[PDB]
Each structure stands twice: as structure tokens, then as C-alpha cells.
Design a protein around this ligand. Sequence first.
Ligand code: LMN
Ligand code: LMN
Ligand code: LMN
Ligand code: LMN
Ligand code: LMN
Ligand code: LMN
Lengths: 201, 201, 201, 201, 201, 201
Amino acid sequence: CGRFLRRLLAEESGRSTPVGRLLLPVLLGFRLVLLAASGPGVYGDEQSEFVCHTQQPGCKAACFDAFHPLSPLRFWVFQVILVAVPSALYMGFTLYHVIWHWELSGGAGSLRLLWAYVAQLGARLVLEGAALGLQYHLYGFQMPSSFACRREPCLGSITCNLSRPSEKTIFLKTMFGVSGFCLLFTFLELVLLGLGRWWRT
Amino acid sequence: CGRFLRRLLAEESGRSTPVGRLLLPVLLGFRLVLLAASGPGVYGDEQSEFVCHTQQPGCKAACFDAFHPLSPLRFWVFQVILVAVPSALYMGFTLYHVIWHWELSGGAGSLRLLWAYVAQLGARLVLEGAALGLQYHLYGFQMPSSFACRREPCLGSITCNLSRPSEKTIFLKTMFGVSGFCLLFTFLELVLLGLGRWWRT
Amino acid sequence: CGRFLRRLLAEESGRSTPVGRLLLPVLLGFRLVLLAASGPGVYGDEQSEFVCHTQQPGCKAACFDAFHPLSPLRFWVFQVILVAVPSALYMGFTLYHVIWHWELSGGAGSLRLLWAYVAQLGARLVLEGAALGLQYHLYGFQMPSSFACRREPCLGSITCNLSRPSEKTIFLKTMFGVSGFCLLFTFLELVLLGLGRWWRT
Amino acid sequence: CGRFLRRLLAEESGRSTPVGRLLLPVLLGFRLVLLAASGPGVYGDEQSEFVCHTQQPGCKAACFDAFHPLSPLRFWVFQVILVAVPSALYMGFTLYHVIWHWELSGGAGSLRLLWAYVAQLGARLVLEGAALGLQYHLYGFQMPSSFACRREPCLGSITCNLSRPSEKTIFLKTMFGVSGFCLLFTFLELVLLGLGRWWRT
Amino acid sequence: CGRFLRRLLAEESGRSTPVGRLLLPVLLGFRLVLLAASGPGVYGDEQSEFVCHTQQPGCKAACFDAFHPLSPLRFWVFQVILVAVPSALYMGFTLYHVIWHWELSGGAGSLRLLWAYVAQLGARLVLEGAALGLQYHLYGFQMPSSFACRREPCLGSITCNLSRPSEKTIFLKTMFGVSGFCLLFTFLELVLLGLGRWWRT
Amino acid sequence: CGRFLRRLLAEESGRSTPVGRLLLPVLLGFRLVLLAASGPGVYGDEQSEFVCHTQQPGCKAACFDAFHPLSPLRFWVFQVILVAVPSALYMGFTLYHVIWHWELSGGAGSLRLLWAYVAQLGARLVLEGAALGLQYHLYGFQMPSSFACRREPCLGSITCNLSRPSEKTIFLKTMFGVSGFCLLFTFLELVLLGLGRWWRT
Ligand SMILES: CCCCCCCCCCC(CCCCCCCCCC)(CO[C@H]1O[C@@H](CO)[C@H](O[C@@H]2O[C@@H](CO)[C@H](O)[C@@H](O)[C@@H]2O)[C@@H](O)[C@@H]1O)CO[C@H]1O[C@@H](CO)[C@H](O[C@@H]2O[C@@H](CO)[C@H](O)[C@@H](O)[C@@H]2O)[C@@H](O)[C@H]1O
Ligand SMILES: CCCCCCCCCCC(CCCCCCCCCC)(CO[C@H]1O[C@@H](CO)[C@H](O[C@@H]2O[C@@H](CO)[C@H](O)[C@@H](O)[C@@H]2O)[C@@H](O)[C@@H]1O)CO[C@H]1O[C@@H](CO)[C@H](O[C@@H]2O[C@@H](CO)[C@H](O)[C@@H](O)[C@@H]2O)[C@@H](O)[C@H]1O
Ligand SMILES: CCCCCCCCCCC(CCCCCCCCCC)(CO[C@H]1O[C@@H](CO)[C@H](O[C@@H]2O[C@@H](CO)[C@H](O)[C@@H](O)[C@@H]2O)[C@@H](O)[C@@H]1O)CO[C@H]1O[C@@H](CO)[C@H](O[C@@H]2O[C@@H](CO)[C@H](O)[C@@H](O)[C@@H]2O)[C@@H](O)[C@H]1O
Ligand SMILES: CCCCCCCCCCC(CCCCCCCCCC)(CO[C@H]1O[C@@H](CO)[C@H](O[C@@H]2O[C@@H](CO)[C@H](O)[C@@H](O)[C@@H]2O)[C@@H](O)[C@@H]1O)CO[C@H]1O[C@@H](CO)[C@H](O[C@@H]2O[C@@H](CO)[C@H](O)[C@@H](O)[C@@H]2O)[C@@H](O)[C@H]1O
Ligand SMILES: CCCCCCCCCCC(CCCCCCCCCC)(CO[C@H]1O[C@@H](CO)[C@H](O[C@@H]2O[C@@H](CO)[C@H](O)[C@@H](O)[C@@H]2O)[C@@H](O)[C@@H]1O)CO[C@H]1O[C@@H](CO)[C@H](O[C@@H]2O[C@@H](CO)[C@H](O)[C@@H](O)[C@@H]2O)[C@@H](O)[C@H]1O
Ligand SMILES: CCCCCCCCCCC(CCCCCCCCCC)(CO[C@H]1O[C@@H](CO)[C@H](O[C@@H]2O[C@@H](CO)[C@H](O)[C@@H](O)[C@@H]2O)[C@@H](O)[C@@H]1O)CO[C@H]1O[C@@H](CO)[C@H](O[C@@H]2O[C@@H](CO)[C@H](O)[C@@H](O)[C@@H]2O)[C@@H](O)[C@H]1O
């Protein structure tokens, strides 16, 4: 499997720039290691870190579900696997293309791989942009220290306190930045292919 | 093992379309990673998240068993391994077929693999459809916030409250959708082989 | 290791039918994945799910040991490793047979492997049948919701309640069925070899 | 690494019988899988399963240390790694012997490996026999349900109760039996080499 | 993949000294194993090891967030992955360079790899120096045993006590030293390449 | 990678005796497996196994930090990775030496590897001896059952009790012995190379 892999890497990346050949794979692996290693330590115990000052039955569960209908740990897991779906389809389409041309040749084919590369960058551009909008819409840029809750079966208005709001705010902003750079260099690799000339006409 | 694997991939998928060659393997791996990474965080602590307002001995255990006789985590594990049984039989039948034709040839054989491919898609079509029916029948499309229980040895009617009903509802619908697309593209790969012509006559 | 493995697979299974070549390995792997993935979630916390209504010292430990002298998780682990012992001896006997005939040949030998295949199916037939009898004898087909205990140092008769009896009953029956099919297809692979002709005379 | 491994297996086991070539490696792997999979579930929580009926400070810790100065989980881990030390020295001595005879030959050497095989079986025979004696001496064949303790700083004599004495007794006897068969087949493989003729004269 | 890897190692390190070829990879792996094996045992339970003498609601969470807005475990994880980003870009740039010169040759190229090696050492020099400054700025060289907190909603001034301040002080200084040696030998490998001659003119 | 590894093993160990070729690698792996498998079970819960008879705030944390400023689990992890640093530098220096002599030769070089082997044994001799001195200095040969503590903010003198002092004493002595044999056979492998002749003159 020495000559095989030396012919797949030169075919999968014979029409890309260094931005899409080196810098994007390293940026996407950075986001994956950071989430797996450090994520559960910050956001793993949100439920026990949510203290409400009351004794009615069912008032804490009603207020925590209004504050966080979805945890950030679940959102970020769905984001990394969605963005990997276009990349996995292009790697498989390239694998089977190399096999059906070793037998005979151990134009119409070389132009077939270029249209597939432009298609997965356009999809990743749409999925990354939509994820950032939901992230700002659901959570924002800061996690508060208190929360007021007027919800049934709570009688009146109660006060609820959170733990570690400074460490959660720092991890939230760090993710927004890594995803922003992934979006920027994906849009840049299209321009260098000639999106500008296609844009005008 | 370079020339061997280059002859098994071209034989196992020399009579399939891109729907069954690229899109289905990526859809089935998506469902497996999502379950392993995110599943236990949502549904792992159902039993401690089920609070009933009483003190009789044995009334909580009676009401939780009426509400959830089977957890969704157990249902989804059985679903992914069943659907993988037809795929594992077809990969082994193809392996031994390549070995018994290398010795001599390093019709009746090529037509033997086509009838085996149609057979595992028909089985997966029946198993996916039956699983969705049980899923809607057992759980539905929403997890409630309260539950009324009139069961022995509880005296009267008691009220029991749940935690995180919004995050559980979102994960339930997300699975129903991924399985629906797996069912759709399995039915589609039969049509493109000629199920329509076989259907009429 | 390409030509080597292509000569071991054709020798280990040159005298077996598809029942013993494809269907049995897939059935035994199914039982192993199901136990590892789902087993601990059902039967992992039996001891804390066993509530007795008393305060004497040592009455709970006396009644739980009378009810479950052995957990199902321990029984099923011993069952899968025992059944794998005859399979591991036959794979090693075949490995060393291929090596001592590559040097010279790169009758008395081909007939040596056939008597070893019949011997491990007979052993697995005896071990699977004995395990099912103990399983029905120890546990049965249903896990109850209550249990009466008259044992020292308990004064009188006490009542003890269990949790999740419906999910434990479903997992118990599912295992009995998978093992039953493993027993059936092991007995069937002997008939197709000629057990009937050997039986009569 | 195809021809290399086909020459090491034929050299490491060209002067052994099937008892030492197939049956002993399978017996030693059986004991290792059983310990790792099932061991912690039985003996992992001994300390919390040891209830003494008192309130003095330090009386429970004094009585548990008199009852179990060493857990069975620690004893069995030391036993499996000690017995593996002679096996690892013989595999390395054989590896370097094959390399220093490929260059030239790609009597005094063949007789060098026979004296090393007899030496590791004699060591394993002494280590297995000593371990069984300590096992019977420390623990016995049964784990009791009660324990009387007259030790300082306990005032008088107190009673302490154990949990799950029936499951611990079954696992203890199962290990004694597997180790007994390992001892038997190690002594048998020496006889078949000619220990009887060496014994007399 | 024998001749391939024998040509990549000689190309990636044909213009480096033993300081950058042996000593730096071993120093960076030392810091990674130490963090993974020993880190969580020291700093994993800071929150439960922070006891404040009060009963007001929300005073403990306010004082722990002022004392530790970021844990050392999170800081050190970000430090090791950042420093690995320049190393991963240089390994990929070297891989694709070897492939595009095997076809033709199975000056302008040899000089292309030298400017890339100087660039990743300069980046690692800036990232290591900035991390040490933040480490001294956030934590210092010692973890105290007490902490005074005048913060809302605490009434007055309260006293809070810490656990294991001696083991945390020892692990903190040990990390500062390993990172200091990584900084020293990175600056030294530039001098031996000729930074002094470039510095003056 | 068959001929490559057959030339590295014969070069890395063409000037060593069986003591440094077989017996030392097996002794160092023994110490690593024993620590990983059995270590956390003995010394993992020291903090909860340290009971002091008082109610003042902060007196338990002050006395446990005086008794154990560093756990044995942390000491032994640092000891095994330090001793592995000289071994990792010598394996890398040998790898690059084999590559720069395959091209030409597929005296000054053979004598270069001998001075590197003597250098890593001298370093390991100094690191093993210093570790044993700290081990006896910090912990000793026995773990007590009680401990008297006169430290602020404790009023007077209090008594604190430990759990499992017999199992901790046995594991401590077992490690001291394995490290002693590693020190002995490292000093012995220098003598057999000719340290005696170098010592006198
Ligand atoms: C590109 C631009 C985007 C444009 C907007 C797009 C809008 C998208 C909708 C956003 C969405 C999450 C869904 C997306 C997650 C997908 C991720 C999938 C990953 C899976 C791996 C968040 O909910 C919205 O609702 C707002 C409140 O109304 C929230 O505002 C905050 O509110 C303040 C409270 O005071 C806060 O104090 C403040 O912080 C904000 O003001 C926001 O979170 C958001 O706007 C919708 O959630 C909805 O889900 C359902 C259950 O499915 C919820 O439960 C249902 O109703 C419950 C009774 O209510 C029952 O109990 C439950 O039984 C029932 O089921 C709903 O209730 C609702 O929550
Ligand atoms: C190369 C030379 C460096 C030159 C200096 C550079 C300055 C860098 C800033 C350092 C920085 C950490 C950020 C860096 C971490 C990046 C790592 C990323 C890794 C991610 C994987 C530490 O905070 C600074 O602030 C000082 C206090 O003011 C602290 O001093 C100590 O204080 C004494 C208390 O009495 C101690 O007793 C004593 O020990 C020290 O005196 C120091 O920690 C430091 O100086 C800034 O933190 C800031 O973050 C934000 C939330 O983002 C915090 O929360 C916000 O405000 C809260 C109300 O306040 C709200 O509640 C919260 O809702 C809101 O959000 C802020 O509050 C603030 O903390
Ligand atoms: C393709 C179309 C499908 C067509 C329908 C097919 C029908 C399939 C039957 C569905 C099935 C699960 C079995 C399938 C799981 C297989 C998965 C295997 C994976 C393994 C890896 C769910 O049970 C049915 O029963 C209904 C209630 O009667 C439930 O309705 C809900 O009820 C409302 C309550 O008020 C809820 O409020 C509301 O939410 C619903 O109204 C539904 O869950 C369902 O209809 C049958 O369960 C049965 O199992 C047995 C124990 O085996 C149970 O325990 C036995 O009886 C106990 C005393 O009772 C004893 O204590 C126990 O000792 C004894 O043993 C039974 O009791 C029964 O539960
Ligand atoms: C092919 C056809 C099979 C033909 C039958 C073959 C008979 C096989 C014997 C079955 C066997 C398990 C052993 C097999 C497990 C091997 C698996 C190895 C895997 C290891 C990886 C189950 O015990 C039998 O005994 C019966 C009770 O007498 C049980 O009936 C139930 O009882 C009702 C109670 O009221 C239930 O309510 C109801 O549910 C049933 O009526 C059944 O479980 C069974 O019949 C024997 O167990 C025995 O083990 C010993 C300790 O070794 C036990 O402890 C000893 O005595 C204690 C004082 O007693 C002391 O405290 C203890 O200190 C001492 O040591 C014994 O006590 C005894 O239990
Ligand atoms: C080759 C021959 C060796 C020759 C001797 C060499 C001497 C080496 C010094 C040994 C050393 C460990 C350091 C080595 C570990 C490196 C391992 C690195 C691995 C990392 C992966 C043990 O401390 C010494 O001190 C003695 C006490 O003074 C101890 O004796 C025992 O005491 C009896 C009590 O009554 C016992 O009852 C009895 O059992 C013994 O009598 C012994 O442990 C030892 O002698 C020094 O520890 C020092 O560390 C610092 C924090 O860094 C400690 O904290 C500082 O002060 C605190 C207020 O005090 C503050 O609270 C804290 O905030 C502050 O920071 C110090 O306090 C001090 O402890
Ligand atoms: C081939 C034939 C064998 C021939 C016999 C050879 C004899 C071998 C000695 C056996 C040995 C274990 C050591 C072997 C483990 C090596 C495994 C290594 C694996 C490591 C990976 C078990 O101890 C012996 O002592 C007996 C009691 O005296 C025990 O009997 C039982 O007692 C009844 C009580 O009433 C029971 O009710 C009943 O069940 C039995 O009657 C038996 O366990 C045994 O005979 C010796 O243990 C000794 O260790 C030391 C600490 O090192 C212990 O602690 C020391 O003293 C404490 C004050 O005492 C202090 O508190 C402590 O601070 C101090 O340190 C000692 O106390 C002592 O225990």
C-alpha cells in the first residue's frame, strides 16, 4: 500500500492550494481535540451547578429547562459531524475513481474531480455560517450568574444561581473564534479558485 | 494486501449506484457516532430524574416501570446491530467468492452476487420500517413534564415530575429523521435496479 | 501476508457449508456486542435496586444473597468464553498445519482437519445445551416485582421490592433466543455433514 | 513480515508437544479475560460491603484490616504477571537467535533452545504451586457471612456482617480450578519430554 | 512503506542538529504524558476542595469564581495543542514535497524546506514565552491555604479553606520547569543555525 | 519493514550482554504494568480514608497536608518517565545512524554507538539511586494506623485514623524491591563491559 497511497494523495489534492491542503485539516482537528479533552470538564455538571432557592416540587426542573433547552456540548457534537459529511463523500468518490483507472492506465475524468471539490466547499460554507447564527441566538457571548424564573408550578418569582460563569464564558468565545477562522479560510479557498470571475458573469 | 483490496472493492460494488456505494455507508455511520457520543448524556440518568411526591414503599418503582418499560438507549442499540447483520453476511459471501476464483482466474458467478445484493436491501427495508413503527408506538414525538400514576401499592393518584423534557424531545426527533432517510435511500436503490419492471409483471 | 491469509481461509473452510462459514460467526458476534453495549445498563445496579422494609442489621444482605446467588452478567461472561475455547484450539491446529506443508508443498493431512472440525461442533453442542438448562433453572423467564424472605437474622417475614422488572424480563428472553439459534445451527451443520448416516449404523 | 513469522513459529515450537503448543496458551488467556471482565464486579466494593455495629472512632478500620490484609484482586494480578516473566524471556531469546542465523544460513544452536524451554517450565511449575498454597492459606474455600473482632480501639467484642458471600465463594473456587489445570498440564509437558528417564538416573 | 519512510525522515531532518532532532521531541512528549497521567488526580476536584464558612445562598460560587476564573488543567491543554500547530503544518508541507519529486527524481526545492523550519521555531518561541507569562500572572509559584473574599452577595468578609496546597504547589513548579527547558532548547537551535550572523546585519 | 527491523535490532544490541538485552526490558515492563493495574486500587482514595475526630473548620485539611505532601502514585509516575528519557534518546540516535549508512553501505561509526550505550546506563544508575533515597526519606517501610497532629487552626492535639495500613505497607515494599533489582542489574551490565579496568586506572 505504498504506491497506492502515493497516487491517491497526489490526485485528491492536485488542484487545491495550500490553504485547503494544509491549513484547513489542521484547523478542524484542533477543534475536535479541544472539545473532547476539555469540554466535559466545563459543561458536564450544569444540572447540579444550578441552585434555586425554593422547596416546591418541580420548580427547579421547570426553570432549568427554560434556561437551557439544549446544552452546548450537544450542539458542538452535531456541528463537527455534519461538517464532516461532505468531506467523507469526496474521499470515497476519489477512491473509486483511482481504482477504475489503474486497470487501463496503470479530460472527462480530471474535470470530474474539480466539480466535486467546489461542491463540498459550498456546502461547508453554508453549514458553518448557519451554526454560528444559532450559537449566538441560543447562548450569546456570556453566561450569567443569576436567572429569574416566572414559570409554573413556581409560586411568584424565584432566584437561581449558577457556578463557574467565568470559565464557561471563556470556552464559549474560544469556540466562536475557531469556527470563524474555519469559515474564513473556506471562503478564501473558493476565491483563489476563481469565484470572482464566476460571480460577475 | 494492496492488489487484494483493489479487487474486492471493485467486485463488491461493480453493480451498484452511487446511492448504495457512498451515501448509505455515510448515513449509517452518522447514526452510530451520534448515539455513542451524545446518547448517554441525555438518557443515562432517567431513573434519578423521575421524582414522585409520596413516601409509601414501592410506589416510585411501580410508576417508573409503567412509564418506561424499555429505555430508548436499549432500543437504538438493538436497531443498529440488527441492520448490520445482512451487511455482514454479504461481505463474507463476497470474500470467499474472490478467493475461489484467484487460483483459476488470477456468468454463473457474476450473477450469484447480484441476487445477494437485492436480498440484503429487502431485509434492511423490512427491519427499518418495523423499527420506526415501534418507536412511534412506544415513545411518540414528545416526552412530557408530568405523569399521573394509579397503580398498586400506591394509595390514590400521585403526581410525578420529569427533568429535561426539551432536550429529550429534540434528540428523539433527530433520530426519527436520520432513520427515515436511511429508509428512503434503501427503497430508492431498489428502484434504480429495476424494481418497477419486476413490480408490474 | 497476502498470499498466506488467502491460503488459510481456503483451508480452514474447504469442507464446511455456508451455515458454519457465514451464519455462525455472525450469530456469535451479535451476542457479544449486545452483552458489552447493553448489559451493564440493565443489571449493573441490582444491589441498590433491592429495597427491603426493615431496620435490623444484616437482614437485607441475607435476603439479597438468597434471591440472587449469581448475577446474570457473570453467567453470560463465562458462557461466551467457554464456547470460544474449542474454536481457538481449531484455529491454532490449522495454523501450524499450513506451515509444515509450505516448505515441501509450497490424504492423511486433509483427513486430519475434518476430524477436528467435527470435534469442536460436538463440544459446543454440549456446552450450549447445558448453559440453557442452568439459565432456566436459576432465573426462569420472568423477574418478579416482590420477594418474601424468611431468613435469619430477620425477625418474622419481610417484604422486599425490585426496580425495573419489565426491562430485565425483556433482556433475559432476548438472550435465551439468540443462544437457541446458535444451538440450532450448530446441530444443523452436523446433519449436513452426515450425522444421519453415522447415527443409524 | 510473512516469511519471518513463518520461521519463528516453526522454531519456537519445533520441539514441543500439542499440550504446550495449543492447550497452555489457551488456558492462560482464559484466566486473564475472566479476571479483567468479571473480577472488579465481585470484589471491587469490599470496603463498603463491610458493616460493623458500633460507633467508636476507628473500630471499623481496625477490624477490616485484620480480616483482609490483602484483597484477592491484588493477589491474582501479581500471579499472572509473575508467570509471564519466564515466557517473555524465552520469546526474546528465540527472536535474537533467528536473526543471527539468517545472515549466514538464510547442533550447538538447536540444542541451545531445548535447554531454555525446560528451564521456563520448571520455573512456572514452582511459581504456580506456591501461589495455590498462599491462596488456600489466606482465604480458604469459603467467604463467611459474619466476623467477630476483638481488637483495639474496639471496646468488647463486636459483630460485623458481609454482603454477597455466595457469589464471592463461587468466583474463588473457579480460579482455584483454572490454576490447578495450568499446573497439571505444565507438569505433564515435562514428563512427555523425558523427565521420567532423568528422574531415575 | 519501508523505502518511503526511510526517505521522509532523511529529508525532514537533513538540515537540523541533534538538539532539534532528538532532544525536543522527547521533551514535548514528556510534558504530554505527565499531564494526562497525573494532572486530573491533583486538580480534578478543586470545586469540592473549596470550603467556605457561611450559609448565605450563592456566596461560595461567587468566591470560587473570583479565586480561579480558569483552572490550570484547561490552560495546559490549550498550550500543548497550540505549540503542535506549527509542527503539524511543517510535516504536511514535507510530505507533499516528497511526492512531487518521486515521479521525476525517484536547489529551489532544498532551499524551500529550510525557510519553513526556521519559521515554525520562531512561532513556537513566541507561543512558549507568552504562555509562561500568563502562568506566572494567573497562578504564581504557590497555592495558598486560605482566601479572603469580600464579594456580593456575601455579607461582610468570610474565610475559605483549601485542601492539598503542598501537592498543587509541587506540580505547578514542575510544569514551569519543563516548559522553560523547551523554550531554552528552541532558542538554542536557532543560534546554531546562524541567528547570530543574521542578528548583527 | 522486514529487513529494516532485522538490521536495527542487530545494531542496537550487537555490543550488549543478555543482562541488558533480555532481563532489563522485562524488569522495567513489570514495574509499569503493576503500577497501572494495581496502583489506583490501593492509593486512590487516601483522602476519604483519613478520618480525624474534630469539628473545627479546616483542621482535617491541615493535618492531611502535613502527613502526605505528595502521594506515592505521583512519585512513581515521575520515576518511570524520567528513567525512560535516556532510553528514548539512544533509540533515536541509533535509528538515524542506520539510515545514513544504508545509502552507501546498503570504525568511527561502530565506536560511536558504544559510547552512547555507556552514557545512558550511567544516567539511569544515578536516577534510580536518588529515587530510592527519596522513597525511604518520604514514606519509609511502613504506613501507620494513627497520626498525631498539632497544627493550626486545630485547638490542642487531635487523633486521626487511617484505613488499610497493611495493604499499603505490602505494596510499598514490593516496589522498593523491583527498583532495587533494576539498580543491581544496571550496575552489573557496566562491570561486564569493563568498568573494573577503567576504575583502577
Ligand atoms: C440562523 C438564525 C436562526 C433563526 C432562529 C431559528 C429558531 C430555532 C429554534 C430554537 C429553539 C431550539 C431548537 C434548535 C436546536 C437544533 C439543534 C439540533 C442538535 C441536536 C443534536 C430554542 O428556543 C427558542 O425559544 C426562545 C424562548 O421562547 C428562547 O429564548 C430564550 O428564552 C428565555 C426564557 O425566558 C431565556 O431566558 C433567554 O435566554 C431567551 O430569550 C431561545 O432559545 C429560542 O429563541 C426552539 O426550542 C423549542 O423546542 C421545543 C422542544 O423541541 C421546546 O419544548 C416544547 O415546549 C415546552 C414548553 O415551552 C415544553 O416544555 C416541551 O415539552 C415542548 O416540547 C420549546 O419550548 C422551544 O424551546
Ligand atoms: C504576557 C503578560 C500577560 C499580560 C496580562 C494579560 C491579561 C489577560 C486577562 C487575564 C484574565 C483571564 C483571561 C485569559 C485566559 C485565556 C486562556 C484561554 C484558554 C481557553 C482554553 C484573568 O483575570 C485578571 O483579573 C484579575 C482580577 O481583576 C485577576 O487578579 C486576581 O484577582 C484577585 C481577586 O481578588 C485574586 O485574589 C488574585 O489572585 C489576583 O489579583 C487576574 O486573574 C487577572 O489579572 C481576565 O479574566 C476576565 O475574564 C472575564 C470572563 O472572560 C471575567 O468574567 C467577567 O466578569 C465577571 C465579574 O468580575 C463576571 O462574573 C463574568 O460574568 C464576566 O464574564 C472577568 O471577571 C475577568 O476575570
Ligand atoms: C409495528 C407496529 C407495532 C404493533 C404493536 C406491537 C406490540 C409490542 C409490545 C410493546 C411492549 C414492549 C415490548 C417490545 C420491546 C421489544 C424490543 C427488544 C429490544 C431488546 C434489546 C410495550 O407495552 C405495551 O403496553 C402498553 C400498556 O399496556 C403501553 O402503553 C403505554 O401504557 C401507559 C401506562 O399507563 C402509558 O402511560 C402510555 O405511555 C402508553 O399508553 C405501550 O408501551 C405498549 O402498547 C409490551 O410490553 C410488555 O412487556 C412485559 C415484559 O416483557 C411487561 O411486563 C409484564 O407485565 C408487568 C405488569 O404489567 C409486570 O410488572 C412484569 O413483571 C411482566 O413481565 C408488560 O407489562 C408489557 O409492558
Ligand atoms: C442442566 C440442569 C441443571 C441441574 C441442576 C444443577 C444444580 C447447580 C447448583 C445451582 C446453584 C448455583 C451454582 C451454579 C453456578 C455455576 C456458574 C459458574 C460461573 C462462574 C463465573 C444455585 O442454588 C440452587 O439452590 C436453590 C436454593 O436451595 C435455588 O433455588 C432458589 O431458592 C429460593 C430461595 O428461597 C429462591 O426464592 C428461588 O428463586 C429458587 O427456588 C437455586 O438457585 C438452585 O437450585 C447452587 O448454589 C449454592 O452455592 C453455594 C455457594 O457456592 C451457596 O452458598 C453456600 O450456602 C449458603 C447458605 O445457604 C452460605 O450463605 C454460603 O456461605 C455458602 O457458601 C449455596 O447456598 C447454594 O446457593
Ligand atoms: C537523596 C536523599 C534526599 C535528601 C533530602 C532531600 C529533601 C527534599 C525535600 C522533601 C519535601 C518534598 C519535595 C520533594 C518531592 C519531589 C518529587 C517531584 C515529583 C512531582 C511529579 C518533603 O518535606 C520534608 O519536610 C519534612 C517536614 O518538615 C517531612 O518530614 C515529615 O514531617 C512530619 C510532620 O510532622 C511527618 O509527621 C513525618 O512523616 C516526617 O518527619 C518530610 O516529608 C521531608 O523531610 C519538601 O516539601 C516541602 O514542600 C513545600 C511545597 O513545595 C511544602 O509546602 C510549603 O510549606 C507549607 C507549610 O509547611 C505550606 O502549607 C505550603 O503552602 C508551602 O508551599 C513544605 O511544607 C515542605 O513540605
Ligand atoms: C506456601 C505456604 C505458605 C506458608 C505461609 C507463608 C506466610 C506469608 C505471610 C502471610 C501474610 C500476608 C503477606 C503475604 C502477601 C504477599 C503477596 C504480595 C502481592 C503484592 C502485589 C498474612 O498474615 C498472616 O497472619 C495471620 C494473622 O496473624 C493471618 O491469619 C488470619 O488472622 C485472623 C485474624 O483474627 C483471621 O481471622 C483469619 O482469617 C486468619 O487466621 C493470615 O493472613 C496469615 O497467616 C502476613 O501479613 C502480615 O503483613 C503485615 C504487613 O506487611 C501486617 O501488618 C503489620 O502488622 C499490623 C499489626 O498486626 C499493623 O497494623 C501493620 O501496620 C503492620 O505493617 C501484619 O499484621 C501481617 O498481617
